[PDB]
Amino acid sequence: VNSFSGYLKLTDNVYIKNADIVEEAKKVKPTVVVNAANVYLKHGGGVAGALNKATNNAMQVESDDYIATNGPLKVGGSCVLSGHNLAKHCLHVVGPNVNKGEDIQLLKSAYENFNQHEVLLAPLLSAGIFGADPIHSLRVCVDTVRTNVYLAVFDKNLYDKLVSSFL
Ligand SMILES: Cc1nnc2n1C[C@@H](C(=O)O)N(C(=O)c1ccc(NC(=O)NC3CC3)cc1)C2
């Protein structure tokens, strides 16, 4: 028994709720929150900008030091950094950005990073401003992640479509 309240059960290990991931993190303070990162950890908009604003830019400050030492991530890759005021840890995961010409097949590799953590609060990778279809992202998530994932979907109409079309 963990602290996630109001999630609807989709599979043995995947749960879904209509809420902003940033607001879910502030309330729950999970062990791991997943950020929809880019390879530069430049958190300007979307999930990344939203979570970073909630950290008063401390996420960006930590991220810039990480990149200065280690260089960019790979598309499909991840790193673990502080969760600041939102979580114990933030798992920054880079899904392909199809609006930028990146390969959608890399979405499975991105979700595989979740398997290194027993429980995660997460958004739909590669969706939103990354350009992939949310329905597809949920399918890859369910078919790739084996650990316990709590998906927070901000958009009510998208949430309803994801639940109603789920196979
Ligand atoms: C439509 C559509 N198609 N795909 C998606 N969306 C909307 C949204 C969702 O979950 O429904 N998605 C995101 O990536 C996202 C989710 C949450 C956030 N938080 C956010 O801005 N907080 C504001 C500042 C307080 C930003 C971006 C995926």
UniProtKB/Swiss-Prot annotation:
Reactions mediated catalytically: Thiol-dependent hydrolysis of ester, thioester, amide, peptide and isopeptide bonds formed by the C-terminal Gly of ubiquitin (a 76-residue protein attached to proteins as an intracellular targeting signal)
Outcome when changing residue 31 to A: In strain: Mu/B.1.621
Domain Macro span(s) in chain numbering: 1-167
Domain of life: Viruses
Subcellular location field: Host endoplasmic reticulum membrane
Modes of activity regulation: Inhibited in vitro by GRL-0617.
Membrane topology term: Multi-pass membrane protein
Purpose: Responsible for the cleavages located at the N-terminus of the replicase polyprotein. Participates together with nsp4 in the assembly of virally-induced cytoplasmic double-membrane vesicles necessary for viral replication. Antagonizes innate immune induction of type I interferon by blocking the phosphorylation, dimerization and subsequent nuclear translocation of host IRF3. Also prevents host NF-kappa-B signaling. In addition, PL-PRO possesses a deubiquitinating/deISGylating activity and processes both 'Lys-48'- and 'Lys-63'-linked polyubiquitin chains from cellular substrates.
Quaternary structure annotation from Swiss-Prot or TrEMBL: May form homohexamers. Interacts with N protein.
Protein's UniProt name: Papain-like protease nsp3
Source organism per UniProt: Severe acute respiratory syndrome coronavirus 2
Taxonomic lineage from the root: Viruses, Riboviria, Orthornavirae, Pisuviricota, Pisoniviricetes
